[model samples]
Target: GKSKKWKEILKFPHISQCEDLRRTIDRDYCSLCDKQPIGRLLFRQFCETRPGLECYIQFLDSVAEYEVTPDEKLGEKGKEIMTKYLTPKSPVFIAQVGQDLVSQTEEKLLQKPCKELFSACAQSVHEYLRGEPFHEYLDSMFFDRFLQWKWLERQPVTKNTFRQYRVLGKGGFGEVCACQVRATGKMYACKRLEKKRIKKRKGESMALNEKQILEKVNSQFVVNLAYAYETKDALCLVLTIMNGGDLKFHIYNMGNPGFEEERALFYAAEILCGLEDLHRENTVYRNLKPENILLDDYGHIRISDLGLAVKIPEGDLIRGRVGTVGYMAPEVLNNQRYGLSPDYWGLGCLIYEMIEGQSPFRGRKEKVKREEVDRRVLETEEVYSHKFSEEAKSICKMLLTKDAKQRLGCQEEGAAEVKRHPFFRNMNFKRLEAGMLDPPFVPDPRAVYCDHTDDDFYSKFSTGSVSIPWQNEMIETECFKELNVFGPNGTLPPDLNRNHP
Candidate 1:
């Protein structure tokens, strides 16, 4: 009888059997412990000490005391220090001083990758400083550890004061909650990913990498890393939560949030900026789509859900199938060792959706065959479009190119093409440093991801929205994103420039 019931239970056979949710947070909540008052204290205290806040798992962007911890005269404390972060196969968090050395030559900050690089990394610091707990938790204490632990808060435009709220969405990774941060009481979206999830793959290490990688990247139009802190429940990534919600939901809402030419360009440009910086680190957002695109209270664009990010091999093409059905690219969809171009192709689909507020190519009749779909993508002159702008159509033509040789992104034209386009000419790539023009469209004022719908999907494993439709269910996770060489480096040093898109 037990065997019959055991076999009947397919996914979560027992409450205790599931492994800690990888990439997100441990799906196995601190349920047992949190239920008991004493257990809650014990859990909170223990977490704050290691991967939590007490010792402070700083997401280091540049060199400072946290990074120096390993190099310090560990003496007898070496093992203790090492033990704290060495959760065997878990993730680690790092910090350091002299991150100013990480600063780019003021001259190069104008270039595409470099501009985004310095601007983004530097901007985050200002936010960190303004963050209420930042001074008390990480800065006040760690300031002495480094000559200058000044957080990256620079401008009022970018300065994010997120308010707090209840949970909005929950999944295997971590729960996304709504909050109203300080300074700006505007309702903002926020995501909470647990360190346990980071540790699940290679304990405490992924956390270390996110800090460094995010610090090095700078893209105004991309998802901004506003502020960060950690708690027993998870590593609190207090981001500029987009209230308009994820692209998938907006598309499904099918109203004022509907996709249009200008809207496509707006969101696509931001996404392009994200890909631009991601490729510099040779990192690939293996997953890119409407689901990942979120809007802010001001209707400015922000890309979310980075759990699938992977630093590829140096100069090696990453050829394999990984993603949702209609949004996946030709090469990877066909199972080839391609590089970052797939993200570009995925962008094409996303931009197309932005135009029509949905994928015209969704479940295409003739294009269901990979070869046929790919052929149309490469050869079509009209851009195989569905209600988009001339500039947007042109962008699709270039981004969807199947011929890697002739692909616009394959050349210096990648950023150049995007910059010169009619859709984005108004986007002075230079002004990003100065903070001039605000995004025309902004996030919904009242929306935030602090609570989940009262639908059965929360317990039933559904996205509840069709457009974002739980792609992770399709993405094969076992042995895909993780490899060992990454352990040695603070994060997987992105294998740069293979399929440079």
Candidate 2:
């Protein structure tokens, strides 16, 4: 085993298994496709009796690019276009058009220059995945034909269990791709966070905390985490897809006039139910905005983006100056010790903006500073000058009360007391929790547009190098276990496959 040389003279699974996968379990005597620099020393060090699925997947994914393709059949120009834009991870574009129109367009585009068709397909696929028209689009005759000609690889998904379709959003963290699980053929939103960036941000402990918090939440009114996994460079989180899109999109289109009282109340009522569960768990949802409030296909509101959430003991204070501008509570802005009531304060702010079409308090004079806006929040009284009803005004005032103890839901009865407000008069919350209440507006699958697609936020990351670096130092260190998508000893996380049947 300590000899100067080691070589893997193994046959492919198709060729033969000289030894069963179980028999080659000896890390010392058996190597993978290639030999290490040392005679099974590195192999033994990295293995626990045998190589893990992580190794096999990486090996399989490595040669994936070299597999068969129909480039020669696509003519010179078509093959050239594939070289330019086609990638294993590039999302398959799905164009949306009327049935007859799609037939005409598909025929014309299919015969036209392949480059033009590819560009149109990419943007269309982007829009389709971003939840524009927001439900699954299965115009198989049109999109499926395009794929066969282009031979576009459906982007490899979590453990190859899904196919990545498009980027939802991307930034310093990484990217969120719209993916569909292969086994059940269901859709899910998948996110990737780089291991290096995670390490830079107290990530060692923070990632675990974030995962635990997300996993603890399982509510109909919140986007729940379905699974998580690891790749060489990123951490992946698979969540329930909200193709219906975020509430901000709806509010933006309804600008100036704002939402009708009934529409706003329905959304607020659903949000309140989501909050109740978090409050009972003693978790502070520091981030709450129209952007984080997503509507599912059924038109039910699901509060999402729990990155800043934290759990504390009852009546204890959470200290952190967190949350988005205008929506953050007074105590959070001041960096004072706060409680669950700040979330309720944010609820009041969201309610006010939803019904008023503008923030509750801001300056009219030119160029107001962020500090000034935040200062005004502490100094100003409840700005109820809007034309809302008496019941709405009364409840907003109670929820926005400056004193945490005096706030509407900050007391022992919590959200129950808030639900009893006249603003929600004659409401059947049992039915609401059961998702029986219909929303005033359900976004049209044909009319709505999601800006996340057709945007340049992810263009930079999308075109980056495709392979895992051979020189990554993090993988050989303790930080590897913490940062990698794997759990420990180069194995899949215990829960990655547990959630599925």
Candidate 3:
């Protein structure tokens, strides 16, 4: 039996005939025939010509292929369509989806509800862009596009490239500062690593490795690196600065209660897609937590921080005691050599935290000194499984399954296997990754979304602290020196006072 939802999907509008497509493509119009081999090979020639419901059908096909394709094989064309159209400045969809079909020829098309059609359109873009074909294309063509989109990269970074702004924070790697491109007038978070620390720790190669990985990371779900440069004392990475702060900030400080299941799923899907991007490069993102998830001005989340990420050779496993206290997978804490399953375990922890008020393993009874880290992550016991929706609970159980080999995303299918689970049944991962699915909550535009607000904040923060020594390693810096972010003055630099952190 065809799904009841499939009947509703058929109600959405589609192009009537070759005439409708001819109205856009050809001056001398005739019955439509595909010109692009890329389109025909994927059974999307009709989509290549028309711009409506056919696109959605193609999108569904792409997602189906993405879900079923073996990682080592050749089935990833769906991602190609998405990478061309789904990146930050990329088009939403090549041929847009809608129930509002144009002038009819011989064929009559379906009519769908407005929101449903819109949702379908969005999901189509999501599946195409977030899948493997796009990633493969990006690995090959990103730098070419970087040069083509000269607007953002017109003036690549040099030592004298940026006019440094404010001290954002200090971490184990180095200090983060706000900076503006002298040419584009754009604001970015410049993470400046002390050269001595990197070379000393033998992480200079790791730093360069991360740069390469990030260069190929072209998804909207991950924070993008705009440029990398070096000064006399520091190696600087210019990245998209997320002003809406981390997920922890929102869940703990902004909202009194936890997010609803709808909001939680939106973020969960985004994180999964981001991890999938990393896994495609054979890289394991050992760190997956709310703090590492940053929200952009538009209130969309992006995965940040690739410091602990390691690329594995085929048939190899990652070994480490990486990741945060509550977010680390059992295999990781057990010191077991593991693959991608641990990341899924961390994702499960993240979703549980978002839906519930607290971490799954960090509650009252387990708060004691005895067996805290041991029982929390290393053990198979779960304490709060009864608190969430059944679908969510089901996801938690399988994702948090003790045996890494039998985990939810541990199958040969990878992340796709998890997508088939019941928790994401009503949700569309395609739409979710495409930035088309409406988030359950959105922060105010003035406060979080618009770049102008970020500009103003940067301008003021730099007003007092725009000294080069701030960028230089004159004073030895501690990793948690930014524990008091505003510094020893204990206030917002005394120049600007608004009680904002």
TM-score of each: 0.50, 0.58, 0.61
- Please report, in order, the local distance difference test score of every candidate based on alpha carbons: 0.47, 0.58, 0.59
Q: What residue runs in model 1 are displaced by over 4 Å at the alpha carbon? A: 1-164, 178-190, 194-212, 226-230, 256-258, 363-386, 421-428, 431-435, 447-501
lDDT of 3 by residue, 1-501 (tens): 222242232121221222233244332111111122222222332233334434444556555545433333322333353454333344344443232321220011133112222234445455554453333433322212211222221223475556788887678879988887543345779988887776678675677767766655666788677666666767777777777778988777775446778788888988888888877877888788888898877778889898777778879876887777777787887888999888898888888888886777776234554358558666647755444789998898788888899889988899989888899987767556656677666666567321354334223222212212122111123211221123253322321232431
lDDT (10s digit) by residue, model 1, range 217-283: 4454555454454444455554444556667776656444455565556566667777887888787
Q: Is candidate 1 or candidate 3 better by lDDT?
A: 3
Model 2 over residues 1-501: C-alpha lDDT tens digits? 111221111101211122243233233222221232121222223322322212322222222222222233334444433433332332321124233443443553356433233334434433433342112111221112212211211223345655778997776567888876443345678877776676667454555556656666756787676566566677777776777778877777654536876788998998999999888788889898888998777777898888788888776776999888877888888799988888899889888878887667753233677887787788887566546888889888888887787999988888999999999995667557755667777766654447453123223223221111111111232222332233465443432223331
Q: Cα lDDT of model 3 overall?
A: 0.59
Backbone atom clashes (below 3 Å) for every candidate:
60, 4, 5
lDDT of 2: 0.58
Tell me which residue pairs clash in candidate 2.
93-125, 94-125, 133-445, 230-485
lDDT of 2 at 108: 39
RMSD over all Cα atoms, model 2:
22.2
* Candidate 2 local Cα displacement, residue 318, angstroms: 2.0
Indicate the residue-level lDDT of 67 in model 2. 25
